Ligand binder design. Structure first.
Ligand SMILES: [Cl-]
Ligand SMILES: [Cl-]
Ligand SMILES: [Cl-]
Ligand SMILES: [Cl-]
Length: 90
């Protein structure tokens, strides 16, 4: 069964979430999803690992590269995410 795909339209304060790396591990993860934000409305959850941004694999890209892809020059983003406790990359 398909990973969650969160489709967000940019709001007045952006999407409403933080993205961060974790020492000792690869990847970028969701944190601090703001109440009432497009992020919350789309079902993004703190702790989710970000796998794709707008159809492009960011599984192991750097923090800067992933942030740049989310910010792009677009006003909408599609985030493919997984729960790392339930999903592993092989
Ligand atoms: Cl703020
Ligand atoms: Cl958090
Ligand atoms: Cl959350
Ligand atoms: Cl999952």
């Amino acid at each position: 069964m398909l990973p969650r795909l969160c489709c967000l339209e940019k709001g007045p304060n952006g999407y409403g979430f933080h993205l961060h790396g974790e020492k000792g591990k690869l990847g970028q993860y969701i944190r601090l999803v703001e109440p009432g934000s497009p992020a919350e409305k789309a079902g993004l959850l703190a702790g989710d690992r970000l796998v794709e941004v707008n159809g492009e694999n960011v599984e192991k890209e750097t923090h800067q590269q992933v942030v740049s892809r989310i910010r792009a020059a677009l006003n909408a983003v599609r985030l493919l995410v997984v729960d790392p406790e339930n999903d592993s990359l092989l």
